[PDB]
Structure formats: structure tokens, C-alpha cells
Amino acid sequence: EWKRFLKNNWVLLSTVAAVVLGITTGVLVREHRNLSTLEKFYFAFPGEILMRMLKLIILPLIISSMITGVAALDSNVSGKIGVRAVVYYFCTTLIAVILGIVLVVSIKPGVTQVSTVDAMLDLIRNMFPENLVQACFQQYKTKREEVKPKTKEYKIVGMYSDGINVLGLIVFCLVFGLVIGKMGEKGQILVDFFNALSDATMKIVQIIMCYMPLGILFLIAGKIIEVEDWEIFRKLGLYMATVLTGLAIHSIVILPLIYFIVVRKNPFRFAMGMAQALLTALMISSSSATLPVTFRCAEENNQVDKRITRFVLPVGATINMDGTALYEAVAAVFIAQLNDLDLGIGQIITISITATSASIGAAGVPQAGLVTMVIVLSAVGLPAEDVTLIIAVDWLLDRFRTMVNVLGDAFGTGIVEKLSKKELEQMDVS
Amino acid sequence: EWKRFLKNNWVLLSTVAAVVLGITTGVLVREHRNLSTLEKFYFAFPGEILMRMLKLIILPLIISSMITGVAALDSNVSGKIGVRAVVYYFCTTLIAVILGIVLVVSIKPGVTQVSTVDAMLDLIRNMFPENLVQACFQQYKTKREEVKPKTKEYKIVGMYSDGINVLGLIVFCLVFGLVIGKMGEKGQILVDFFNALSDATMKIVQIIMCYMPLGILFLIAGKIIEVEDWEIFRKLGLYMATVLTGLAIHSIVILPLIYFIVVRKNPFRFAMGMAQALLTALMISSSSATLPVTFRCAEENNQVDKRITRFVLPVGATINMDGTALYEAVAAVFIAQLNDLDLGIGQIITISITATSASIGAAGVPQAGLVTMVIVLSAVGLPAEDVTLIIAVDWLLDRFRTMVNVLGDAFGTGIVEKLSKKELEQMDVS
Amino acid sequence: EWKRFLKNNWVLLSTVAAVVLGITTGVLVREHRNLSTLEKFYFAFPGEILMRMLKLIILPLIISSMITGVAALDSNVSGKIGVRAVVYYFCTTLIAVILGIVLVVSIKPGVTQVSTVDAMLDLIRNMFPENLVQACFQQYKTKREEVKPKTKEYKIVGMYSDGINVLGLIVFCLVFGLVIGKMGEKGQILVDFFNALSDATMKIVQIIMCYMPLGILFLIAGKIIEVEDWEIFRKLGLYMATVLTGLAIHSIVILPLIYFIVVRKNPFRFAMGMAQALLTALMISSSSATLPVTFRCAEENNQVDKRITRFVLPVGATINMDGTALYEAVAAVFIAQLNDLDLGIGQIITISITATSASIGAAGVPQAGLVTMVIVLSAVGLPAEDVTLIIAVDWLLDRFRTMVNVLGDAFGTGIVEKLSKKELEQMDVS
Ligand SMILES: CC(C)CCC[C@@H](C)[C@H]1CC[C@H]2[C@@H]3CC=C4C[C@@H](OC(=O)CCC(=O)O)CC[C@]4(C)[C@H]3CC[C@]12C
Ligand SMILES: CC(C)CCC[C@@H](C)[C@H]1CC[C@H]2[C@@H]3CC=C4C[C@@H](OC(=O)CCC(=O)O)CC[C@]4(C)[C@H]3CC[C@]12C
Ligand SMILES: CC(C)CCC[C@@H](C)[C@H]1CC[C@H]2[C@@H]3CC=C4C[C@@H](OC(=O)CCC(=O)O)CC[C@]4(C)[C@H]3CC[C@]12C
Ligand SMILES: N[C@H](C(=O)O)[C@H](OCc1cccc(NC(=O)c2ccc(C(F)(F)F)cc2)c1)C(=O)O
Ligand SMILES: N[C@H](C(=O)O)[C@H](OCc1cccc(NC(=O)c2ccc(C(F)(F)F)cc2)c1)C(=O)O
Numbered sequence A, B, C: 001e002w003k004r005f006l007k008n009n010w011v012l013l014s015t016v017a018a019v020v021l022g023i024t025t026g027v028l029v030r031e032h033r034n035l036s037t038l039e040k041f042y043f044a045f046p047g048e049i050l051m052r053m054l055k056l057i058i059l060p061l062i063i064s065s066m067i068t069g070v071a072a073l074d075s076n077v078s079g080k081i082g083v084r085a086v087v088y089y090f091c092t093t094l095i096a097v098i099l100g101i102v103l104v105v106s107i108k109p110g111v112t113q114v115s116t117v118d119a120m121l122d123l124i125r126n127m128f129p130e131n132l133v134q135a136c137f138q139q140y141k142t143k144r145e146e147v148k149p150k151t152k153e154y155k156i157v158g159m160y161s162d163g164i165n166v167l168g169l170i171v172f173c174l175v176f177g178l179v180i181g182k183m184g185e186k187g188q189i190l191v192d193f194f195n196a197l198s199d200a201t202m203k204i205v206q207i208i209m210c211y212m213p214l215g216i217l218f219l220i221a222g223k224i225i226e227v228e229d230w231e232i233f234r235k236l237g238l239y240m241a242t243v244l245t246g247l248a249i250h251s252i253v254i255l256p257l258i259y260f261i262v263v264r265k266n267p268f269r270f271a272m273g274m275a276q277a278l279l280t281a282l283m284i285s286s287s288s289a290t291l292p293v294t295f296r297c298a299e300e301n302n303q304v305d306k307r308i309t310r311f312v313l314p315v316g317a318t319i320n321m322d323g324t325a326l327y328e329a330v331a332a333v334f335i336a337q338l339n340d341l342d343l344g345i346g347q348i349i350t351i352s353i354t355a356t357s358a359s360i361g362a363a364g365v366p367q368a369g370l371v372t373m374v375i376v377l378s379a380v381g382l383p384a385e386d387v388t389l390i391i392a393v394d395w396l397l398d399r400f401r402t403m404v405n406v407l408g409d410a411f412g413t414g415i416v417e418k419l420s421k422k423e424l425e426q427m428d429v430s
């Protein structure tokens, strides 16, 4: 049993092997030959091809996947027992993103030891672009300049700068998906077309992630060829500390507080019954294959009605990801702080909207998480190549992210139980 | 019976209420606080968001709606009794547009009391763009410059300026719609795809028109905050006079003359039999819901064969709109004259082609008339925000436009009767 | 029998009539009136409209036709007897393109009697664009510049210059076609959509080629209005000599050598049995209507198993075109040499990749060959209007190109016979 193991375990092993081979070839190149500025650009060329292929695919991905995500979510949601679960999912994902932003701008890993009305108005001017083909490559930006023919007079001009407009595409695909989902039968050809387009785009994302380790080997080798002071590793350690304390105070202080103020019962006697599901979600690292274990730990080990467990858990296994959203907020602001750049408050809200609204179009392919980390890095215009310093860390944080996703939608079945106590008697009587 | 009335009547009431609340808040703001140049730009911001949302939707609208319009018109047209009706519709729509252009450049409302070969050649260079994705945001423009190493030597250069190319998209969607309509069975998937895309785009146009009154309230308030001399209201009165005399000499002098030179019978004894249909089209303001009344006033109150009435009236209720085309020509040249701008003769023919060829893709949603008024304002590059001064007037001219649409296709059943007298005996004998 | 002949023969007759009427009107205009620089630009205006319409159509053509070509080729290929035919087709098409490039840069018709690493790296940077909508109009270009705060220090910058990116669209449509062809049943709506889009694009190419002779009449008239020295006709004669010697040493020296080193039998006793098929492919000038004649000349006049002839000949009649690929390579480098331009080695490999990979999406419409000659002229950014000087020659080289296409796929049935001798006994035993 040798080729079977490397058949089943090739993502984690190729990522770890690429990290260690890249670090050892960077050390063996640096302490044996000094490279100039030109040949440090030809050495990090497979990484350039990988960071081009990752940006090539995000446009049909965030069109087709967002359209089918919101159409299938509209199809699944039925009564007023399917509204409360969606509201719960999106409130806790927003709370997780806000906690991650507060923690990453308070701890500050990565820093070494004009009005704010125009940003908040360009945030709304970019949700409704003036052209829909041009939204696939250029954004808006307004600038307050001074007109002169005792007080100053001002005038606002606008210019279309380069870079994709993820907020306008997210908003238009949300509205278009709701419209073609509620059209019924006359817009079933559109749902079929965008569903097959989403499948064919997830397969190309899997092809790119088959190429990926040969790219991040050269990117890691080219990112320790300029190192001198042993100091970027402390920035990585502080980023791990920020993500782990964000998950540790999101799954202890916030979610049991939500359970206590809604249900008015003890959250820890609830969460002690989910121990098999949480240890399983740590061991197998996916929150959709630990679904039967959390089925038999909520209907049996607690006392939850199956009529709500048959809805909340299969929906929340795909669209309720608190830990991934907190991770993407913390990682985007950490990449911004690593490049000697201070974000505004239009950029923080763009990160905070693109991190929770990219949970809707979540199929079930765990590779595309990396593509989501490019999308929130490309909604605000940050250089994507520094995401290499996240991927080398990403195999040590996936376990706890899966644990917090499972804990969020396992608390959801307790939340939606108390709110919908009339409708369960209505489905019991008739 | 109170909430039922405001349920059935909410378009006219929200438009009128937005107009009067905008005028009273502009008067109450102007005579109580003086605003600078900067805070006159933040006051007209919901209007900016509305004029962005109106431009966001015109590209999938004029692609999908033109394709399904010309494909369904090709499907409906059968023999040589279905050719004459289409030729009649397009000749009278062109005559109405030409009469509107002549009247608006002769009366001139809105004015206060390089060769012309290169424009006419850019008009043909813009019907066949050199790229089809770039036609969704940029147009061509040629400039005759002078080369110098006794008579002058010249040379033509070309540059792609910004702004959508409505003429190239209209021509390509007309040819593409005819091709996939005549392909039969192998191109039925394309007709289904673009038909569902047209439905899903009309629903987003209805969503935008649900937002509209909150936008035109602030646009009207921001357009009487710069007023001083009581003079733009006289320009509005002259625009109403031009549209009403255009309809009054199109439905008295031109259409009865066409009837007299084709049929050689009295047009007024014909039109006196359509009195119930004309008063109905005034009372209910839509020319597709007054269709049974004009059915029973042409087959009964006159003497028209039903074999031509069953074709001409259901087709001409959607694609034969003379009054709307005259209105859009007069309103586009009035918006050009209001902004101290003299149009050329390439721009007048672009207005005159986009006004009659946007009657083909007419589904049956009466909101999208406003979107058509943006399209002819965006084929020639005029600022769209001044269309606010049309919308406040638009509830006083819709009745007479519906009356002239009904009168045009009611004269059509008399026209096509005399021309096709052999084919009716051929359908009677066999 | 007069109108029947001009019904069946209108492509060759309109091309020849346009050539002779254009030459006689250029001679009658030049020796009777001298034109300035400005009115030499209005005389060649229908040619400008034709060269705009030819560029308008290449984007949906190379998207939809490449997708359906590689999906249908994936569907047809079954066992290991369908792999060897595809490998044979693409190796001989590459050998033909390489022979054409060597012959055209060695003979040099058309000439009158920065690193090369950055070009070869932009060749790979253009196969994976950073945006997919922007790949429909702009390409990448890197430039090695010098940074200055004894040896020089350099730094590579990049800029997106204008012009369509045929290499990125070809690579993405190849990967997308393979993915939606191997998805099976869940991506059949995509195969149907792109198949109907390919049919509707071939019909618009036939409409443009109905317009074509009125365009090339004025282009030929405007290209002999600047002639003085009788010297461009010698360049045309040398281009004919280069294409004819390329076909003459591709169908005598290379293809019988491939047959001799694979089959180890005499190629001329094989090719003497194909005499009826070769004379037929000369007389009727299409290699897909001479298919039954080469069916009955390989299974009967030789001794080829029908189980391989029923696969190799219907596939190789559409995707195996050696003579057309050699012609397009020679013609693109000849158009480059005619405009006083020396190609690099990124541009020669772009021509050499776009010439063999545009044989995959080959439906069966013989007009679109001209559109392929624009595509390889637009992957490297050459002025397309000089393709007029190819079209006037193109009716004298089509016969021999059809002969070499038929000879290539007729040698293929002898090649694939010897390689697959085990599988034929496996299909005979069971
Ligand atoms: C840092 C901590 C203290 C933040 C606490 C946040 C809470 C105040 C939020 C988060 C989850 C929210 C709940 C999530 C879901 C719902 C269901 C929602 O929908 C319905 O019950 C009605 C649906 C219908 O019938 O239309 C009403 C609000 C409510 C109870 C929310 C009330 C406010 C809650 C408890
Ligand atoms: C300002 C006023 C005086 C303008 C007058 C315009 C008329 C001269 C036009 C407008 C309507 C036209 C008619 C509209 C429709 C048709 C049908 C059309 O098609 C057919 O009858 C033949 C169809 C076929 O069999 O192919 C022929 C032209 C005709 C009579 C047109 C002839 C010219 C008309 C009368
Ligand atoms: C200028 C001249 C001398 C160039 C000569 C070129 C040859 C060396 C090339 C061209 C055609 C090639 C052949 C084309 C097709 C095939 C089938 C190909 O596929 C298989 O037989 C295996 C398929 C499988 O089972 O997977 C193996 C290589 C081979 C024999 C190629 C071997 C190399 C050949 C003979
Ligand atoms: N393993 C965790 C756990 O199972 O919840 C967690 O899973 C992340 C995950 C799992 C499955 C699918 C996805 N997301 C997607 O496939 C995806 C695809 C497309 C988009 C889009 F928005 F369209 F760009 C966004 C997301 C993410 C993690 O790794 O952080
Ligand atoms: N009420 C009048 C009466 O019933 O004829 C008359 O109706 C205008 C009307 C009625 C119904 C539909 C439409 N037009 C559309 O929906 C439309 C939709 C799309 C386009 C496109 F060209 F594609 F942009 C053009 C028009 C216009 C008017 O209000 O002037």
C-alpha cells in the first residue's frame, strides 16, 4: 500500500514538498552564486505563469459560480424556516469578517518595528458600473480637484483606472441569478447554461492547481533569494497567531453568546455533544465529508428535530464558512501591510464584502479556496504574488478552519430550533 | 377600495409625486441655504446612481432584445401578405422620424433668444466595427489632417474615442437574428437562449424603474437649484408644443394622404369608424391592451377581411410605433439643443436610424420606453441626465402617442387590404 | 444551360472578373486623371469596409469553431487506433509549416533587389493572458530597460499594446473544448450552444464572401494606381514559385520518406494507385467531395483494411490540411517581407502555431480559408489589406493544395496500417 497513499494524499504532499524544495534550492543558490536584478526575474518565471493562470480564470468563475450559487440557494429556500437559516449564516459570516479585520489592524503583523467621503461614494459608484464589458477590466476613481477662474471652490472629476471590478460583477450576478431563478420555467435554459459553465470552470481550476507546486517552488525560491535578516518568518508567525486567535475567540466567545441570547440554554452542554463531529472535522479536513457524523451528533446526541436538520446542515455545509471568511480578511490585510501600504476604509469594506459574498458561489471543490484568496486580493488591487507566503502556511490552518465551519453550522441547528416553534407544530398537526 | 387603487396606479402617481416633491424641496432648499459647487454634487448623487444603472442595462438589452425581435418577426412573416405590412410599418416610422427632425430643427426649442463627407463615411465605418468586444465601449472617428514633407495635401487618420457603439450592435444583432431565425432547427438553442436573456433583462429594467422616482426627485431638486430666470419652463412648453404639433400633423396630413394615394377611398369615413378604439387608447394608455377594441372596430365598423386583420393588428401593436419614434427624435435633438450643442448630419442620421430600429426589439414592457430614450441619447454621445426634464413631461404626452400608434396600425389594415386583392381570392378558392 | 452554370460556378468567376475589372479600371483611371493623396483614400473605401467586415467576424469564429472542433475531435477519437492518426496529422502539418517557413525566408520573395529571449518569453506570457475579455483586443510586450539610482543593471517592464491575442484565445478554447467534451452529459448544453454558434458564424462568413468581389475590385484598382515600375508582378511570380516548390518538395520528398521509414515498403507503388483520387481532387477543387473516390482507391486499388479506412479518411478530410498550412505560412511571411519588415523569432513561431492549430476548427466551408489568412496575419500584427495580392493569385494554387491534402491523408491510411497490426487481430478474433 504505497501508490494508493500517494494517490489519495497528493495535495498536502505536493504543497509541503514544494515548500521544502523551494527553501533548500533558494539556500543552495544564494550561498553559491550571486544573481543580478535581471536574472532574478528569469528565475521567478514559472511563478509568473502561475500567477497569470490564476488571474485568467477568476472572471468566468465569479460570473458563473455566483449565478448558480444564488439560483440554487433561492431554489432550496422554501418557507419561513429557510429564511432564518440564511439570515443566521450571513450575520455570523459578517461578524467573523469584522472580528478578523479588527484583530489584524490591532495586532499588525507585517509592519516592521482626498477625503474619506469620496472613497465611501466610489464604493457605491463601483457597485453599478456604467458599462458591463468594461467592468471586467476597469474600475472608477474620483478625485476632488480645485476650480479657479476667499474660500476655496472644489469640483469632483472621475477616471477609469485599470483592474477588474469584482464588486460590480458580484452585484450584477447576484441580481441576475435571483431574476433567472424566480422566472421559473422560461429561464431554465439560462440556469442550465450557467450550471454547466460553472462545472467546466471548476475543472480548469483543478488543472491549474495540478500545475501549482512547480510554480510555488520557484516563487518560494525567489522569495528567500532576497532575504537577509531573519524577519519575514516572524511576520509569518504573527500571521498564524492572529488567525488562530481569531478562530479561538470566534468559536468560544461569539458563537456561544449568540446561542445564549437566542436559545437561553447552556451552549457548552450543547457543544460537548458535537465532540465526534469536531474531532472528525479535524482528522478529515473537509466540512462536507464530515456531514453524516454531524447529522448523527445533532439528532441523537442532542435533541434536535430532524425536520430542521434536513435543511440547515446540507445548506450550511457549503455556504456557511466563518473560518474561511475570517482567514481571507486577515490574509488580505496582512498582504496589504506586508507591502508597506496602509489601506483606506473603502478598501477595507471592499475586502469585507468580497469575503462574505464569495461564500454563496461555493460548489464543493476545495482547491478553489486559493482562487478566492486571489479575488479578495484583486478587488482592492494588491499584488497577488505575495499569496505564496500564505500557501506555505495554509496546510497548518486548514484543520481549525474546518472545525469552525462545522461548529458554526452545528450551532445553527440549535438557533433555528427555538425561533421556529410554531411552524413545527403546524407541520406536526397537518 | 384604497390600497387597490394605489396598487393598480403606481407608475403615474410615483412619477407625479416625485416631480412635485422635487420641485418643493428645491424651492425650500434654495430660499433657505446657499450651496457651494461641491455640495451641489453630493445632493444630486441618487440621480447619478440612477443614471449609472440606466446605462448598465442597455448593452444586454440591445443585444438580446434586438435578436429576439427580428427572429420572432421573421417567424411571424409568411407570405406576400406579411411582407407588405412590414414595409408599410417601416416606411411610416421613417416618415414620422423625418417629420419630427424637420419640426424640431425648424421650431428650435432649447436655444436661448472637417468635412461633412467624413461624418457620412464614419456613419458607415461604425456599422461594421473592427472588433466586436470593443464595439461595446468605443466608437470610430476620422480626422482629415495635412501632410507636409502650391496646393495642400491631406491624409485621413482615425482614432477610437470612448462611448458605446449602438449602430454596430444594432446591425450585427439584426444580421445575427435573421441568420439564427432562418437556420431552422439547428439554431433553436440560440433562439431559446436569447429569448430567456431578453425576459431576464426586462425584469431588471422593471427593478430599475422601481428605484427611479427616488432618483428623479433628487435630479429635479438639483436642476432647480441652479435656476434663476424663469426660462427653462418656456423651453419645456415649446418642446411640448413641438411634440404635439408633430403628432397633430402626422395623424391628419400624412397618414390619410398615404391612405388616399393607396386605397383611393375617403380616409375620414374610415377613421370615423375607429372612434371607440381611439378614445379607449386615450383612456387606457397602452396600445396593446386596446387591441380587442380595435379588432371589433375594423372587422365590424368597417369592412375589412379578417384574414388580414388576424396578422396586421397583432404584429403592428408591438413593432409599429410612429408616435414614440417621433417623440424620441424630437427629444434627442431637444436635449442636444439644450446643451448649447449643434448636431451635425452624421449625428442626425444616427438618431434617425436608432429611433426606428429600436422598435423591432419591443417586447411589451412599457417601462423600457425610458431606456430607449437613453439609447438614442447614447448613440450620439449626449449627456443623459437631462432626460430628467423629459420624464417630468412624459406623463402628459403618453396618451397622444398611444393614439397615434393605434391610428397607424388601424390605417394599416386598410392599406394592406387594397394591395393584396389577388391573394385573398386565392385563399378563398383553395 | 447558361444560368445553371453561373449558378454552380460563381466563386471562381466573380473572383476572376473582379481581378480583371479592377486592373482595367486602375489602368483607365491612371492614364486619364491624376489623383491626390486624399482622393486615393476615398477610392479604396469599399475595400476598407471589406477589411473591417473580415476582422469583425474572426473573434466569434475562433472561439466557437475551435471549441466545437476540438470537442468533436475528442468525441471521434476512441481507441489507440484513433490516437496514431491524430499524432500523424499534427506531425505532418508541423513539418509542412516548417518547410514553408524555411523556403520563404531562403528564397525571399518581396524584398527588392532588445533580446531574443524576451520575445520567446512573451510568446509564453501571451498564451496565458491576465484577463480574458482584454485578450480579445490587447497583447503583452516586455521591454528590457535600465535602472539607474561598473556593469549595467537591467529591469523588465511590460505594457499591453493593442491588437487581438489569437494565441491566448486558441489555447483557452482548446482547453475549454477538451474539458466540456470530457464532461459527458452535464456539459452537453455547452456543446450544443457552441455548435449552433459555429453554424451561425459560418453563415455570416458566407455573407461577407458574397460581398467580397466588389471590395477586391476597388482594392486591386487602388493597388495599381500607385504602381510605376513593373516589379510587384515579379514578386507575385516568385511567391507562386515558392508555394509551388513547397508543395512539390512536400509531396515528393517528405511524405514518401515518412512512408518508407514507417511502413518499409515502396511509396510510389502505393501512390500510383491513388491516381484517380488525385486527378479528381485536381478537377473538383475540394478535398471533402473527392472522398468516395479516395475511399474506393485505398480499399480496392491497394490492400488497406476497411476498419482503419472508415476512421482515418473521414477525419483527415477536415483536420489534415498540409497544403493549406504551408500556403498560410508562406503567405504570411511574404506579406511581412512585402511591407519592408523583418520578422523576429517570436513572430515566426506565432505564425507557425496559428497555422497548424487553425486546422482543428475546420467545418467544411471553403470560403473561410480567406478568413484564416486574416487570422495568421493578425496574430503577428501585419496590415491585412495586402491579402488582396494573395486573393488574385489564389485561384491558381487551390488545385495543388487540394492535391496535397488528399495525398497526405491517403498516405495516412498506409501509415496507421503498419503501426496497428495487433489491434486488428484483436478486433478480428473478438
Ligand atoms: C458580538 C455578538 C454579541 C453579536 C450578536 C449578534 C446578534 C444580535 C444577531 C446575530 C444572529 C442574529 C439572528 C439571526 C437570524 C434571525 C432570524 C430573522 O428572521 C426571522 O426570524 C423572521 C423571518 C420571517 O418570518 O420573515 C430575524 C432575526 C434573527 C432572529 C437574528 C437576530 C439578531 C441576531 C441574534
Ligand atoms: C409625405 C407622404 C406623401 C409620403 C408618402 C409615402 C408613400 C409614397 C409610401 C409610404 C407607404 C408606401 C407603401 C408601403 C408598402 C408597400 C408594399 C410593397 O410590397 C409589395 O406590395 C410587394 C411585395 C412582394 O410581393 O415582394 C410595395 C411598395 C408599397 C406599396 C409602398 C409604396 C410607397 C408608399 C405608399
Ligand atoms: C523530414 C522527415 C525525415 C521527418 C520525419 C518525421 C518522422 C520522424 C515522424 C513523422 C510522423 C511520426 C509518427 C506519427 C505517429 C506516430 C504514432 C504515435 O503513437 C503510437 O503509436 C502510440 C499511441 C499509444 O498507444 O499511446 C507514436 C509515434 C509515431 C509512430 C510517429 C513517429 C515519428 C514520425 C514517423
Ligand atoms: N476545508 C474547509 C471546509 O471544508 O469548510 C474550508 O473549505 C473551503 C472551501 C471548500 C469548498 C469550496 C470552496 N470554495 C469554492 O469552491 C469557491 C468557488 C468559487 C468562488 C467564487 F466566488 F465564485 F469565486 C468562491 C469559492 C471553499 C477551507 O479549506 O478553508
Ligand atoms: N404607450 C404607448 C403604446 O402603447 O404604444 C407607447 O409605448 C411604448 C412602448 C411600449 C411597450 C414596449 C416598448 N419598448 C420596449 O420595451 C423596448 C425594449 C427594448 C428596446 C431596445 F431596442 F432593445 F433597446 C426598445 C424598446 C415601448 C409609449 O409609451 O410611447
Ligand SMILES: N[C@H](C(=O)O)[C@H](OCc1cccc(NC(=O)c2ccc(C(F)(F)F)cc2)c1)C(=O)O
Binding pocket: C061, C062, C063, C065, C066, C285, C286, C287, C288, C321, C323, C324, C357, C358, C359, C361, C362, C363, C364, C365, C366, C368, C369, C371, C372, C375, C398, C401, C402, C405
Ligand atoms: N480546397 C482545399 C481542400 O479541399 O482541402 C483547401 O480547403 C481549405 C478549407 C476547406 C474547408 C474549410 C476550411 N476552413 C475553415 O472553414 C475554417 C474555419 C474556421 C477556422 C478558425 F480557426 F476557427 F478560424 C479555420 C478554418 C478550409 C484549400 O482551399 O486550401
